[PDB]
Design a protein around this motif. Structure first.
Motif, PDB file in Angstrom:
ATOM      1  N   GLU A   4      37.511  39.348  43.972  1.00 41.01           N
ATOM      2  CA  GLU A   4      36.262  38.614  44.107  1.00 41.01           C
ATOM      3  C   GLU A   4      36.497  37.462  45.075  1.00 41.01           C
ATOM      4  OE1 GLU A   4      34.925  37.407  40.270  1.00 41.01           O
ATOM      5  OE2 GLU A   4      34.882  39.444  39.451  1.00 41.01           O
ATOM      6  N   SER A   5      35.808  37.496  46.214  1.00 41.97           N
ATOM      7  CA  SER A   5      36.006  36.531  47.281  1.00 41.97           C
ATOM      8  C   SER A   5      34.962  35.421  47.197  1.00 41.97           C
ATOM      9  CB  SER A   5      35.956  37.227  48.644  1.00 41.97           C
ATOM     10  OG  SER A   5      36.146  36.302  49.697  1.00 41.97           O
ATOM     11  N   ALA A  16      38.693  34.322  45.840  1.00 39.49           N
ATOM     12  CA  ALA A  16      38.600  33.447  44.680  1.00 39.49           C
ATOM     13  C   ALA A  16      39.476  33.959  43.544  1.00 39.49           C
ATOM     14  CB  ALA A  16      37.145  33.324  44.227  1.00 39.49           C
ATOM     15  N   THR A  17      39.452  35.269  43.300  1.00 45.67           N
ATOM     16  CA  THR A  17      40.293  35.897  42.279  1.00 45.67           C
ATOM     17  C   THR A  17      40.657  37.295  42.769  1.00 45.67           C
ATOM     18  OG1 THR A  17      38.321  36.612  41.076  1.00 45.67           O
ATOM     19  CG2 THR A  17      39.366  34.551  40.382  1.00 45.67           C
ATOM     20  N   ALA A  18      41.886  37.451  43.256  1.00 41.09           N
ATOM     21  CA  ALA A  18      42.397  38.736  43.726  1.00 41.09           C
ATOM     22  C   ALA A  18      43.610  39.094  42.877  1.00 41.09           C
ATOM     23  CB  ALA A  18      42.761  38.675  45.209  1.00 41.09           C
ATOM     24  N   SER A  19      43.442  40.055  41.972  1.00 35.09           N
ATOM     25  CA  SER A  19      44.498  40.425  41.043  1.00 35.09           C
ATOM     26  C   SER A  19      44.521  41.938  40.879  1.00 35.09           C
ATOM     27  CB  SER A  19      44.310  39.742  39.682  1.00 35.09           C
ATOM     28  OG  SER A  19      43.073  40.111  39.094  1.00 35.09           O
ATOM     29  N   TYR A  20      45.502  42.414  40.113  1.00 37.92           N
ATOM     30  CA  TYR A  20      45.635  43.834  39.818  1.00 37.92           C
ATOM     31  C   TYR A  20      46.201  44.000  38.415  1.00 37.92           C
ATOM     32  CZ  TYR A  20      50.654  43.338  40.696  1.00 37.92           C
ATOM     33  OH  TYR A  20      51.974  42.950  40.651  1.00 37.92           O
ATOM     34  N   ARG A  21      45.797  45.085  37.758  1.00 37.83           N
ATOM     35  CA  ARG A  21      46.264  45.388  36.412  1.00 37.83           C
ATOM     36  C   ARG A  21      46.588  46.872  36.306  1.00 37.83           C
ATOM     37  NH1 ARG A  21      40.574  45.383  35.725  1.00 37.83           N
ATOM     38  NH2 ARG A  21      39.816  47.232  34.603  1.00 37.83           N
ATOM     39  N   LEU A  22      47.608  47.187  35.513  1.00 39.90           N
ATOM     40  CA  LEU A  22      47.987  48.578  35.307  1.00 39.90           C
ATOM     41  C   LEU A  22      46.913  49.303  34.505  1.00 39.90           C
ATOM     42  CD1 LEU A  22      50.585  46.786  35.721  1.00 39.90           C
ATOM     43  CD2 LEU A  22      51.839  48.651  34.621  1.00 39.90           C
ATOM     44  N   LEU A  23      46.697  50.571  34.832  1.00 43.76           N
ATOM     45  CA  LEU A  23      45.677  51.362  34.152  1.00 43.76           C
ATOM     46  C   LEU A  23      46.080  51.601  32.702  1.00 43.76           C
ATOM     47  CD1 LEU A  23      43.137  53.633  35.122  1.00 43.76           C
ATOM     48  CD2 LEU A  23      44.942  55.026  34.073  1.00 43.76           C
ATOM     49  N   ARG A  39      35.469  23.340  43.926  1.00 42.11           N
ATOM     50  CA  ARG A  39      36.361  24.440  43.599  1.00 42.11           C
ATOM     51  C   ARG A  39      36.905  24.287  42.184  1.00 42.11           C
ATOM     52  NH1 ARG A  39      38.643  27.277  47.912  1.00 42.11           N
ATOM     53  NH2 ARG A  39      37.107  27.442  49.604  1.00 42.11           N
ATOM     54  N   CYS A  40      37.203  25.422  41.558  1.00 40.77           N
ATOM     55  CA  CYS A  40      37.819  25.424  40.241  1.00 40.77           C
ATOM     56  C   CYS A  40      39.328  25.256  40.367  1.00 40.77           C
ATOM     57  CB  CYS A  40      37.493  26.720  39.499  1.00 40.77           C
ATOM     58  SG  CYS A  40      38.117  26.784  37.804  1.00 40.77           S
ATOM     59  N   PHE A  41      39.913  24.551  39.398  1.00 40.59           N
ATOM     60  CA  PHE A  41      41.331  24.210  39.488  1.00 40.59           C
ATOM     61  C   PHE A  41      42.211  25.451  39.410  1.00 40.59           C
ATOM     62  CE2 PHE A  41      39.993  20.031  37.277  1.00 40.59           C
ATOM     63  CZ  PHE A  41      39.467  19.568  38.465  1.00 40.59           C
ATOM     64  N   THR A  42      41.974  26.318  38.425  1.00 39.47           N
ATOM     65  CA  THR A  42      42.849  27.469  38.221  1.00 39.47           C
ATOM     66  C   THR A  42      42.649  28.520  39.307  1.00 39.47           C
ATOM     67  OG1 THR A  42      41.260  28.588  36.774  1.00 39.47           O
ATOM     68  CG2 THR A  42      42.806  27.049  35.742  1.00 39.47           C
ATOM     69  N   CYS A  43      41.444  29.081  39.398  1.00 43.61           N
ATOM     70  CA  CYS A  43      41.177  30.174  40.324  1.00 43.61           C
ATOM     71  C   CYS A  43      40.728  29.672  41.691  1.00 43.61           C
ATOM     72  CB  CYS A  43      40.118  31.110  39.738  1.00 43.61           C
ATOM     73  SG  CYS A  43      38.523  30.321  39.425  1.00 43.61           S
ATOM     74  N   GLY A  44      39.637  28.923  41.733  1.00 43.88           N
ATOM     75  CA  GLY A  44      39.074  28.427  42.966  1.00 43.88           C
ATOM     76  C   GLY A  44      37.691  28.951  43.306  1.00 43.88           C
ATOM     77  N   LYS A  45      36.950  29.477  42.336  1.00 47.50           N
ATOM     78  CA  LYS A  45      35.612  29.980  42.605  1.00 47.50           C
ATOM     79  C   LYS A  45      34.655  28.821  42.863  1.00 47.50           C
ATOM     80  CE  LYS A  45      34.131  33.300  39.938  1.00 47.50           C
ATOM     81  NZ  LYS A  45      34.312  34.362  40.966  1.00 47.50           N
ATOM     82  N   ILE A  46      33.722  29.032  43.790  1.00 45.08           N
ATOM     83  CA  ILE A  46      32.727  28.019  44.123  1.00 45.08           C
ATOM     84  C   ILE A  46      31.862  27.765  42.895  1.00 45.08           C
ATOM     85  CG2 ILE A  46      30.774  27.429  45.593  1.00 45.08           C
ATOM     86  CD1 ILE A  46      33.297  27.347  47.142  1.00 45.08           C
ATOM     87  N   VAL A  47      31.961  26.560  42.337  1.00 43.50           N
ATOM     88  CA  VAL A  47      31.229  26.202  41.127  1.00 43.50           C
ATOM     89  C   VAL A  47      30.345  24.978  41.313  1.00 43.50           C
ATOM     90  CG1 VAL A  47      32.990  24.695  40.137  1.00 43.50           C
ATOM     91  CG2 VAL A  47      31.424  25.940  38.627  1.00 43.50           C
TER      92      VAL A  47
END
Ligand SMILES: [Zn+2]
Ligand SMILES: [Zn+2]
Lengths: 51, 50, 103, 65, 46, 343
Positions: F310-311, F228-235, D6-14
């Motif tokens: 992104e899961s 893995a990365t679940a975020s949101y940004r203003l348009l 896992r990645c430290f910041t996000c956690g994506k499988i690397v």
């Protein structure tokens, strides 16, 4: 084998050389650096021009 | 990926705030190896530690 | 034992109330804060954390007139639940029509 | 020692892409275009894969075996 | 009871009793490690 | 005018050269005189909408219009931490001769995601290390590295010298418990990527272990995080105060993202315009050009959030969002029931 590939063609592929000689990446890299340089989009080229 | 900013006031004087998920994913994991030695020597008399 | 109520003082005044909620974080705190701030019958609304070690939050609600400050809390909870149901239905319909138009 | 999963910041499988990155290195791909083709947009995974040192083989060279 | 050990260079299973000169066959290395236990050990993924 | 200024303050979020302004949500009753910002379920349902712009395996992107930053951050944090999944917790080792430490191996195995559906399982009660068929999954891993009986004379490459020298996660075998073999069909319970490199061995070494996985949320440990990365940004919504033409158009195109500013020849001269502010990331590179500072106005829409999720591949992002909303609704219902029991 590396020298023969260089004499046959000026461009040699590190992956092909490794797959053929069954050698390790570090040894192939040393053999290629001893007599050639890295060129982008072309592979390895002989350090000196055709004399 | 460090971000220079003040957060929660837990970094007042030279302190820093770590991420729980980062620490859980293996960041900063350390291993401490210690040695414990023992000796079984023979004395002058014909006797030995066992 | 999860959510407990507290009066402002020994006088047992219902105008100002404090709800202590266990095993929670900033998520539900801020959600309920935003959902109850729009109630015109709320003078003051504020959520805080006691300590990051323990998992508990404290919300404080002071009403305008003689509101018990529990009916606004229930109103905010119901409005949040309705918004959640609506967004869930909308997202489900969106995904369904997206799959339909993609296939 | 070994590439983390896992990645430290996000956690994506690397960890599953380490051998792929090594193959791209053996190939003519450079670090930048290799990390771009591997699908790493954010720089956290790029750093994770680029700043990683491969010492598992160096330790196995000393392993009992 | 057969007590087993491993050599530092040959890595062969040698059986020696108590009060014996620590040595290994077909060599002369004097480093003898103990094999890993067979008991069940529980680890936490945290 | 004053009305335009109030509208901007309440709708858009302007980003200045040195700092961002109008960052606080103010659309509440009593804050504005000429605006009745009281809560209205009808207006909320009318203005709210969701539009998916990209949806593929382990990746989703959808714009929500009408929702507030509070609920947006709530959904984000729920997806990040409060979504339960399955992850290896207990590791029983049996004569592990690997060079990798036992604790590091257990941590790496715990960091491996599991494709099992968490909705079909339950949380393990306090204690009960033996585990029950309902709230536990068993994965066996037995890899014995040995020399290749048939190899070249040199065989400088470990791939040819040894076999099974890299213990990938594909070697994990799911051992059913009770009626789990009948409940879940073959091929469902398996590692997600199936290519994660766990460790590297040498001839003579062996890794034998059993992994017990239970249900858990991401708040307790990061290994349960499905996203893995679940975020949101203003348009973003870039607007030009005055028509910019000429080489200034190409300058704007080079300053902003290549896919937001487009140059066109309407009358033989190049004029720039906003094509798709979605691709713009607000690099704030336009502030470098002195003349082009007072010609643009960068802004973010307060009621328009693009969510990107992104899961890791445990379950699709649409179902992840559905489960997040369901968990939030369950929390709300639990609090309502507690309040009802109190009163
Ligand atoms: Zn990353
Ligand atoms: Zn020996």
């Amino acid at each position: 084998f590396v020298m023969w590939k260089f004499t046959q063609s000026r461009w040699v592929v590190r992956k092909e050389v490794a797959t053929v000689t069954k050698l390790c990446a570090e040894d192939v890299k040393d053999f290629l650096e001893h007599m050639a340089v890295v060129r982008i989009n072309k592979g390895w080229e002989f350090i000196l021009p055709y004399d | 990926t460090v971000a220079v900013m003040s957060y929660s006031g837990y970094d007042i004087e030279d302190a820093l705030v770590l991420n729980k998920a980062s620490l859980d994913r293996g960041f900063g994991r350390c291993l401490v190896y210690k040695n414990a030695k023992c000796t079984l020597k023979r004395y002058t008399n014909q006797t030995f530690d066992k | 034992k999860t959510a407990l109520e507290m009066v402002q003082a020994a006088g047992t005044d219902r105008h100002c109330v404090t709800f202590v909620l266990h095993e929670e974080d900033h998520t539900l705190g801020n959600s309920l804060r935003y959902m109850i701030m729009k109630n015109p019958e709320v003078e003051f609304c504020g959520y805080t954390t006691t300590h990051p070690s323990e998992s508990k939050i404290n919300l404080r609600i002071q009403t305008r007139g003689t509101l018990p400050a529990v009916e606004p809390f229930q109103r905010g909870l119901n409005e949040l639940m309705n918004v959640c149901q609506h967004v869930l239905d909308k997202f489900e319909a969106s995904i369904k029509d997206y799959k339909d138009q993609k296939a | 020692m070994i590439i983390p999963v896992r990645c430290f910041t996000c956690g994506k499988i690397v960890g599953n892409k380490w051998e792929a990155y090594l193959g791209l290195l053996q190939a003519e791909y450079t670090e930048g275009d290799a990390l771009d083709a591997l699908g790493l947009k954010r720089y956290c995974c790029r750093r994770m894969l680029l700043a990683h040192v491969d010492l598992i083989e160096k330790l196995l060279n000393y392993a009992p075996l | 009871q057969p007590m087993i050990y491993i050599c530092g260079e040959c890595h062969t299973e040698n059986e020696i009793k108590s009060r014996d000169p620590i040595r290994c066959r077909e060599c002369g290395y004097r480093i003898m490690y103990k094999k890993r236990t067979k008991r069940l050990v529980v680890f936490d993924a945290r | 005018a004053a009305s335009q200024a109030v509208e901007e303050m309440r709708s858009r979020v302007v980003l200045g050269e040195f700092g961002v302004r109008n960052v606080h949500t103010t659309d509440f009753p009593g804050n504005y005189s000429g605006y009745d910002d009281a809560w209205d379920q009808d207006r909320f349902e009318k203005n709210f909408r969701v539009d998916v712009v990209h949806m593929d395996e382990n990746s989703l992107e959808f714009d929500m219009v009408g929702i507030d930053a509070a609920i947006a951050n709530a959904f984000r944090r729920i997806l990040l931490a409060e979504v339960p999944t399955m992850a290896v917790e207990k590791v029983l080792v049996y004569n592990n001769t690997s060079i990798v430490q036992d604790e590091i191996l257990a941590h790496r195995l715990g960091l491996i995601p599991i494709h099992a559906d968490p909705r079909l399982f339950e949380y393990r009660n306090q204690g009960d290390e033996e585990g029950t068929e309902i709230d536990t999954l068993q994965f066996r891993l037995q890899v014995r590295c040995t020399r290749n009986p048939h190899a070249a004379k040199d065989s400088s490459d470990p791939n040819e010298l040894y076999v099974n020298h890299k213990v990938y996660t594909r070697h994990m075998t799911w051992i059913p418990l009770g009626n789990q073999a009948d409940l879940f069909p073959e091929g469902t319970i398996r590692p997600v990527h199936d290519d994660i490199l766990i460790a590297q061995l040498r001839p003579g070494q062996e890794i034998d272990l059993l992994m017990h996985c239970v249900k858990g949320i991401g708040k307790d440990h990061a290994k349960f995080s499905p996203v893995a990365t679940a975020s949101y940004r203003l348009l973003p919504d870039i607007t030009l105060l005055e028509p910019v033409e000429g080489e200034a158009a190409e300058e704007l195109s080079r300053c902003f993202s290549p896919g937001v500013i487009e140059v066109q020849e309407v009358q033989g001269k190049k004029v720039a315009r906003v094509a798709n502010p979605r691709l713009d990331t607000f690099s704030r590179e336009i502030f470098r050009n002195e003349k082009l500072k007072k010609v643009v106005r960068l802004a973010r829409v307060r009621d328009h959030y693009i969510f990107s999720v992104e899961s890791t591949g445990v379950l699709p992002p649409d179902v992840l969002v559905s489960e997040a909303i369901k968990v939030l609704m369950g929390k709300c219902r639990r609090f309502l029931d507690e309040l009802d029991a109190v009163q």
